[PDB]
Design a protein around this nucleic acid. Structure first.
Lengths: 150, 129, 177, 79, 147
RNA sequence: AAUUCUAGCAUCCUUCUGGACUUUUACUUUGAGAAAAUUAGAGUGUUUCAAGCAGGCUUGUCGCCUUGAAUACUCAGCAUGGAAUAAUAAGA
RNA sequence: ACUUCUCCUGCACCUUAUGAGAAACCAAAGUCUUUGGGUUCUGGGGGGAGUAUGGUCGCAAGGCUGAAACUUAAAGGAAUU
């Protein structure tokens, strides 16, 4: 039932049975890895690469074509982000709400939602420190959060 | 969310037993369930079952007969000490003659009848009768 | 050695010189490791199983696969099915060093690597049965499209024999209606 | 009276994605032919972005809820 | 090095040996570390360097602070059975414990094995034998490991 | 032939002549050591019995039964066989 | 926009149960003597009493926590005439 809301939604991508598809496809393992390193250099997140691939170009999935996932390829090349994308987009959301909330102080609903996103940042950071995807002793501060994004 | 995989499937089984279905599917399937269903199948409580190999946990579809009155599960998985297998089934099973406790042991998953003669206790898993 | 490995090795440099030979040049890269004389029950002919070094079997030899199998079938009679030598790794593994034991090397992944390789069509779906006798009859539903060669219907029997000789496990194939 | 092992093609087509016996996607890919260019482009059925041509950008399809609309008379062949 | 008011000297080495260093082999299947032999530190209370037998028990556990000088404190964790309810219960005891300066960089939340010896001060009975580096994240006293 | 346990062969260690390695425990099994009295309990007509630890044969005398008074029971700790289950470790 | 049909996600509704309940009723109050999926909080006849005293929050009004002596054979629930 999600997490924070009461909503209980079943919507998801359901991946196919066969692997290394498709028979119709060709190109190469090598040429796809060049395209990913090109678009990462353009400045584009691991989610946004695989959207750009399956939409315009071929490849349904990169894990089908190459052995590796997209973030595995970026981290091998050394064109990976500093912090992971889900933690990035939660912090950027929290900074956006703090601009709104210190303009409009009487908005109680915005004050409620800022607790929920910043609570999620703290617990999701505690994951990423355990897996060593973040430097040790890395912590969220609402003073220094805005410069940390961009 | 979904702590015991075996605990869901035996409730799914025993419901659709009492309704009186010919066959039922269960989900998400495991290595423990196929071994638990295997030691029902020896004693003659269910027929055949397939286990579809979807690229996931998988689905187990069992043919069944009108034979199980009930099967259940003992969470928490208590420890028992060969002395105390007799004390459990006096409390738990409907009679001394028929029924089975079933309990994981370092010589594989097995019934309490097999656990007596091999002479090793373990952790209790469930039961059926 | 052995006798059958020489017989299969004799056939390969005949495939080189066949006036033109479409795939003769390509094979030179190809090399063979070992064989196994497997006979299907009530089999019309014994079917040779040819093992392949893994490096050779990747980019170098699986590019065609199908064309090569039909040539050795008409040349040598019999049937033939062509697989990679996967090393395996025993559970004790930690002894004698090593740490990760990557799961490509483990026993489930090797035996899955057999099936993809032996049928050679691909598999639409895979399913296993557990009988009241208590023997696990596996099933491997091949794709109904592209049935192609009549031999596939005859060769559908011998995969049960080939799978049983390697892994000691019962497998039944067939095509879904 | 029931067959969970061998379900019908008609009924399992109607069901949701994940509730089927083997789950697989009801989306697909398309070789699209825009009117001016002789070139062809491999385009996903549900496209979230406005897809441009192989040279001098026309426009193949605009994104919607589910399946993207294709721009005027232009043919498409499923893979 | 001579920090203190009295002359710190290693007993075992005589005044004739003034180059020579004494090092004990503690036994019980525990190897002598190399930094005991090579370095020039004293320690009276070290197993490997000075007069103290190790004898009786051996205790593994998690280090929870290293603040006081030449000594640590090691959180042991264990389950306690409660026979009515047929069910376990997480308890702990903080054993305070000596350690020797052969072991460089003993971080908080490290694993450490420690043998019993004669009472060196009031709180400490045990002396260290061997350490292992591992990271622990957040609080150390939360971290339950049974050993 | 069922029911136990165990060696091989499908590519399975070795340093030696039983122990070293297999991440670590829990768990279970067998074993050690743990006072008796009490408690259960073997044997025995205290006249029965609660008890008690005695007795029983026999004109034989260095009396005999090479006389009995068994045995179990007593979380944590020490040790050990083991393929599951569950923690935990890691990620040449 | 409307018609026909399928899919999930909502607030509900009708019908029915060899499912449950003391009954009223209930797709949950079902799968519970054929008793163990995970977990938080609360209750132990009726008064005395949400009172007394102590604590703590409050500008106050009061909130949260919260007894005893003595008292009593019935209080209480759902249906029937």
């Amino acid at each position: 039932g999600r997490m924070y809301g009461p909503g209980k939604g079943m919507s998801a991508s359901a991946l196919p049975w066969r692997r290394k598809p498709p028979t119709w496809l060709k190109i190469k393992p090598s040429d796809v890895e060049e395209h990913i390193a090109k678009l990462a250099k353009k400045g584009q997140t691991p989610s946004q690469i695989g959207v750009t691939l399956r939409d315009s170009f071929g490849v349904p999935q990169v894990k089908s074509v190459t052995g590796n996932k997209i973030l595995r390829i970026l981290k091998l090349q050394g064109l990976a982000p500093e912090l992971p994308e889900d933690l990035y987009y939660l912090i950027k959301k929290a900074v956006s709400v703090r601009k709104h909330l210190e303009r409009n102080r009487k908005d109680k609903d915005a004050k409620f939602r800022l607790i929920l996103v910043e609570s999620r940042i703290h617990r999701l950071a505690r994951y990423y420190k355990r897996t060593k995807q973040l430097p040790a002793t890395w912590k969220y501060q609402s003073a220094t959060a805005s410069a940390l994004v961009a | 969310v979904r702590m015991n995989v075996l605990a869901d499937c035996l409730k799914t089984l025993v419901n659709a037993e009492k309704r009186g279905r010919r066959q039922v599917l269960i989900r998400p399937s495991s290595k423990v369930i196929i071994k638990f269903l295997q030691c029902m199948q020896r004693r003659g409580y269910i027929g055949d079952f397939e286990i579809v190999d979807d690229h996931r946990a998988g689905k187990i579809v069992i043919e069944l007969l009108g034979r199980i009155n009930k099967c259940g599960v003992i969470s928490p998985r208590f420890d028992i000490q060969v002395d105390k297998i007799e004390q459990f089934c006096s409390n738990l099973l409907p009679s001394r003659q028929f029924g089975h406790l079933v309990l994981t042991t370092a010589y594989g998953i097995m019934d309490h009848e097999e656990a007596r003669r091999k002479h090793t206790g373990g952790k209790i898993l469930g039961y059926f009768f | 050695p052995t006798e059958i490995e020489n017989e299969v090795a004799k056939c390969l440099f005949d495939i080189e010189t066949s006036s033109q030979s479409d795939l003769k040049g390509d094979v030179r890269h190809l090399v063979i490791s070992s064989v196994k004389e497997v006979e299907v029950p009530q089999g019309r002919k014994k079917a040779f199983v040819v093992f392949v070094p893994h490096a050779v079997y990747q980019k170098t030899v699986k590019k065609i696969q199908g064309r090569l199998v039909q040539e050795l079938e008409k040349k040598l009679k019999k049937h033939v099915v062509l697989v990679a030598q996967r090393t395996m790794l025993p559970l004790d593994f930690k002894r004698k060093g090593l740490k990760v034991r990557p799961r490509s090397r483990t026993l489930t992944a090797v035996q899955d690597g057999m099936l993809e390789d032996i049928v050679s069509t691909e598999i639409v779906g895979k399913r296993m049965r557990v009988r009241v006798d208590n023997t696990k009859m596996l099933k491997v539903f091949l794709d109904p499209r592209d049935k192609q060669k009549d031999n596939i219907e005859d060769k559908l029997e011998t995969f049960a024999a080939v799978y049983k000789k390697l892994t000691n496990k019962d497998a039944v194939f067939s095509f879904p209606q | 009276e029931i067959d969970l092992l061998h379900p019908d093609p008609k009924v399992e087509a109607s069901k949701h994605k994940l509730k089927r016996l083997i789950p697989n996607p009801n989306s697909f890919f398309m070789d699209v032919k825009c009117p001016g260019c002789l070139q062809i482009t491999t385009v996903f059925s549900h496209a979230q972005t406005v897809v441009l041509c192989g040279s001098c950008n026309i426009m193949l399809c605009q994104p919607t809820g589910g399946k993207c609309k294709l721009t005027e008379g232009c043919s498409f062949r499923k893979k | 090095v001579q920090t203190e008011r009295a002359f710190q000297k290693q007993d075992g080495v005589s005044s004739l040996g003034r180059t020579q260093r004494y090092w004990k082999d503690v036994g019980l299947g525990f190897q002598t570390p190399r930094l005991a032999k090579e370095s020039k530190y004293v320690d009276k209370k070290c197993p490997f360097t000075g007069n103290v037998s190790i004898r009786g028990r051996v205790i593994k556990g998690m280090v929870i602070s290293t603040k006081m000088k030449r000594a640590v404190v090691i959180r042991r964790n264990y389950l306690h059975f409660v026979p009515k309810y047929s069910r376990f219960e997480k308890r702990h005891k903080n054993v305070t414990c000596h350690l020797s300066p052969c072991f460089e960089q003993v971080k908080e939340g490290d694993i450490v094995t420690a043998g019993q010896c004669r009472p060196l001060s009031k709180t400490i009975r045990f002396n260290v034998l061997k350490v292992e580096k591992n990271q622990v994240f957040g609080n150390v006293r939360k971290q339950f490991r049974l050993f």
